[PDB]
Each structure stands twice: as structure tokens, then as C-alpha cells.
């Protein structure tokens, strides 16, 4: 919701993981120091025409380090539903100069990963 980027839908059964040096969405207005953050999982409850609640595919939202719902979580703090990503050469500093997004101000950036990025099974745009 407050994320600057769109979500990464989880279609299969495995969770979102990235090897070291990958996972950070591309941001032209950010510096190589900024390319470091985390993802956060969210599930949805829908009510089909059957009148019965149904669970939809979980989605993951990127948040720069020190920002978002887990702004007070150090990098690497193990917690279910939160995974961490970083580009080699990025500082471990909360990027409050980037902040979160206000849905009344601008739209979410289309989450794009560079060519050569490895995505786990069940993850595709």
C-alpha cells in the first residue's frame, strides 16, 4: 500500500527468496547506496459468488531499509513473511530520504528486475 512498487504475486507454494546481490527493484532516482531493502508478504480474503470466503495468491511488497511496516527491523532479522534483499555495495542505513508512498500523490512504480535475475518457482510477472 505504502510501497513505491507493485507487488510480486506468489502463484505456487514456495515463498519469495533471492540469492545475494539480487531482489532490489530498479529505481532510476535512487543511488547505489539506496539499493537495499526488504519484502513483506500479504494475503487476501475474497468472497466469491458462492457466498464463501476464498484465499487469493499472496503478494509481496518491497520496502526500502528502515522504512515501511517493519521500519524498526534491522537487516537480516529473521521473521516469517519478511525477506531481505540488497545489491552489493549498498549501505545499511535507513533510507528515510526515500520514505514510503502516499497513494494520493503518485502511483506505484512497476516492479522491474534486471535481465539475469533468478526468481524462484511460482514467481513471474
Amino acid at each position, epitope marked *: 500500500t*505504502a510501497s513505491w512498487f507493485t507487488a510480486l504475486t506468489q502463484h505456487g507454494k514456495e515463498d519469495l527468496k533471492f540469492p545475494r546481490g539480487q531482489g532490489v527493484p530498479i529505481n532510476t*532516482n535512487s543511488s547505489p547506496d539506496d539499493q537495499i531493502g526488504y519484502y513483506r508478504r500479504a494475503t487476501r480474503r475474497i468472497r466469491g459468488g458462492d457466498g464463501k470466503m476464498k484465499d487469493l495468491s499472496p503478494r509481496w511488497y518491497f520496502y526500502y531499509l528502515g522504512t515501511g511496516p517493519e*521500519a524498526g527491523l534491522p537487516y537480516g532479522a529473521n521473521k516469517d513473511g519478511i525477506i531481505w534483499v540488497a545489491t552489493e555495495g549498498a549501505l545499511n542505513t535507513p533510507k*528515510d530520504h526515500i*520514505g*514510503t508512498r*502516499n*497513494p*494520493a*500523490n*503518485n*502511483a506505484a512504480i512497476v516492479l522491474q528486475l534486471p535481465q539475469g535475475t533468478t526468481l524462484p518457482k511460482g514467481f513471474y510477472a
Partner: antibody, heavy 117, light 111 residues
């Protein structure tokens, strides 16, 4: 249902500090953005700043040197603090709320504050 | 630019169409949403348009907004004497990291 109401001083000596607060009835602070807007008599609107989740802030850089906005989730209120007030700070001060994609969708009545000795 | 520039005044014949302009830079209009507000005398501003062209509930459908490039426009069809008010455009600014208003446009309905 949501209604806003500003309250505080109606007059503040120059070089002092303006301190207004806005009380939210009909809803909660929650995760919404709560702004402060001022308008001098006969002039245009000027955005001061807003506060939101985790008390995070954004200020107009023109007033950033002197402005401080706070929030109190318990009292369902948020306040404005403007220091070293000059005559250019005499205006009607509004509080507003950003409801997701609708910015400043609900405004308060606006309280008139004048800076004079 | 880093501010929004509107014409200071405008007027039109009732029952017809009139538009108000709003000029900005790539740091505000050229990159973020534009929203419009109406301020009747003695009252607080009222949201007319959000997300460039979306209408909140209660706003008459004769109000219409648009944006292209670094400019935005507010169109009012079927002008009515009750539309006589001040109109403000506003948008987020990445350079200032803050919200910026336009000067405002005095609308005068005739007849």
C-alpha cells in the same frame, strides 16, 4: 461522519511560537495523512505539512526551518508548532486528511490566527 | 518551475463551458497526480478532482479534469451561477518533497 475542528490561540506576539491543534471526531487518526494548510486574508492557500504512520513527517521546505507537527493517537488529535512567527504567518489555519487516493478530502473550519504586539 | 501558475481570474456565460489552466514543471505535474479544489467565500476548500481526472462522490459531473505534459486543466460544462468561487490546483513536488498549490483563479458567472 468524519469532522475536523481546529483549536488554539487567536493571537500570538511576533517572534513567539504558534501552537494549534486539530481534533478528529467521527473517525480515528489510524494510518491517514493529516495536514495543516494556511491562507492569509485575501491570498492563496499554502501547504504546511502533514503527519502519518509512525509519526513520519513532510514539511514545506519554505517553512521547514520553523515548523513542527506532532500527533497523539490517544486523544485522536494532531498539532502544529510554528516558531519565530512573523506577520507573514497571520492567516486562517486549516487541518485536513488524505483518505487513500483522495487528498485533503475533509477540511476543518479553519481558525483565524493573527501575529501582532 | 517549482510552483503552480494559474490565471488570476476567469468568467463565462451560464449554461456553457469554461476551463481553468494550471502550469507546472516535471517535478510536480510532469511526474505526480493533480488535484483541484473549490473555495466558496468564507468556507474551506472542497475537493473537486483527484488523480488527475477522478470525481469524488457528490461533485457534479459537469466538473472535469485532465493532465498532459506539465500542465493540467479543470473543465466546467453547463456553467451555473453557484459555480462562482475560487479554484485551486495542487500537486506533489519531488524537488521540494512537499505539496504545492496554485495561485488560484477567481471565477465569475454572468447573466
Amino acid at each position: 461522519q468524519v469532522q475536523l475542528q481546529e483549536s488554539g490561540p487567536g493571537l500570538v506576539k511576533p517572534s513567539e511560537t504558534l501552537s494549534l491543534t486539530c481534533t478528529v471526531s467521527g473517525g480515528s487518526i489510524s494510518s491517514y495523512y493529516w495536514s495543516w494548510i494556511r491562507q492569509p486574508p485575501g491570498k492563496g492557500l499554502e501547504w504546511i505539512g502533514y503527519i502519518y504512520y509512525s509519526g513520519s513527517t513532510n514539511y514545506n521546505p519554505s517553512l521547514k526551518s520553523r515548523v513542527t507537527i506532532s500527533v497523539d493517537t490517544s486523544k485522536n488529535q494532531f498539532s502544529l508548532k510554528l516558531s519565530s512567527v512573523t506577520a507573514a504567518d497571520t492567516a486562517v489555519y486549516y487541518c485536513a486528511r488524505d483518505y487513500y487516493q483522495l487528498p485533503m478530502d475533509v477540511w476543518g473550519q479553519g481558525t483565524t490566527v493573527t501575529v501582532s504586539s | 518551475q517549482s510552483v503552480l501558475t494559474q490565471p488570476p481570474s476567469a468568467s463565462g456565460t451560464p449554461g456553457q463551458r469554461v476551463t481553468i489552466s494550471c502550469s507546472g514543471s516535471s517535478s510536480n505535474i510532469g511526474s505526480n497526480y493533480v488535484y483541484w479544489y473549490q473555495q466558496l467565500p468564507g468556507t474551506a476548500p472542497k475537493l473537486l478532482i483527484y488523480r488527475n481526472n477522478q470525481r469524488p462522490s457528490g461533485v457534479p459531473d459537469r466538473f472535469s479534469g485532465s493532465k498532459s505534459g506539465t500542465s493540467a486543466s479543470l473543465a466546467i460544462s453547463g456553467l451555473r451561477s453557484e459555480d462562482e468561487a475560487d479554484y485551486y490546483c495542487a500537486a506533489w513536488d519531488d524537488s521540494l518533497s512537499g505539496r504545492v498549490f496554485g495561485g488560484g483563479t477567481k471565477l465569475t458567472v454572468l447573466g
